[PDB]
Scaffold this motif. Sequence first.
Motif, short mmCIF file in Angstrom:
data_model
loop_
_atom_site.label_atom_id
_atom_site.label_comp_id
_atom_site.label_asym_id
_atom_site.label_seq_id
_atom_site.Cartn_x
_atom_site.Cartn_y
_atom_site.Cartn_z
N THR A 171 -2.70 0.64 -4.27
CA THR A 171 -2.16 -0.67 -3.94
C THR A 171 -1.62 -1.35 -5.19
O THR A 171 -2.34 -1.47 -6.18
CB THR A 171 -3.24 -1.56 -3.31
OG1 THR A 171 -4.25 -1.82 -4.29
CG2 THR A 171 -3.87 -0.85 -2.14
N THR A 227 -4.50 6.78 -1.83
CA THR A 227 -4.00 5.44 -1.58
C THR A 227 -4.02 4.63 -2.87
O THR A 227 -5.02 4.62 -3.59
CB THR A 227 -4.86 4.71 -0.56
OG1 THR A 227 -6.18 4.56 -1.08
CG2 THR A 227 -4.92 5.47 0.75
N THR A 265 0.92 5.51 -0.02
CA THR A 265 0.18 6.72 0.33
C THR A 265 1.12 7.92 0.33
O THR A 265 2.23 7.84 0.86
CB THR A 265 -0.44 6.63 1.73
OG1 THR A 265 0.61 6.46 2.69
CG2 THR A 265 -1.40 5.47 1.86
N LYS A 298 0.84 -1.19 0.00
CA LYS A 298 0.00 0.00 0.00
C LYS A 298 0.88 1.24 0.00
O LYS A 298 1.84 1.32 0.76
CB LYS A 298 -0.94 0.04 1.20
CG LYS A 298 -2.07 -0.93 1.10
CD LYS A 298 -2.97 -0.76 2.29
CE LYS A 298 -3.70 0.56 2.20
NZ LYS A 298 -4.63 0.54 1.06
#
Length: 58
Positions: free
Chosen positions: A35, A33, A6, A4
């Motif tokens: 992924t 965010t 961010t 992940k």
Amino acid sequence: AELKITLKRSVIGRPQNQRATVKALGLGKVNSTVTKPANEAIKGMVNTISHLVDVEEV
RNA sequence: UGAUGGAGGUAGAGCACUGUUUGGACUAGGGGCCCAUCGGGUUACCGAAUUCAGAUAAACUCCGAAUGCCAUUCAUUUAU
């Protein structure tokens, strides 16, 4: 496996390596965010934006 | 961004050369007198014949580097 991610900083005041590596991941707004699966290009993407980006491993 | 191959003398310690350089040994032999009108030139400067250590560069260096750049029917993400 997968990661992940961010942003937690801003892109402003930074050189054009880091802008290009951010837009290459798809990170537009702050605290967005994304992924993505753990390759060995992506770990190199993160080893130049380590200070702008936090990483969770989910 | 990751992987691979290569082009090239920048950051300097470094008596590989080019100039600049400080000490010691040594002599090839010479310093107005040689000491003398054949043996020690003598105290001393002693380089080059030599050599023991130490300095140093922008136009001095067999050899680098930090991926910087150029390339790949290569890989992942993105949108030029």
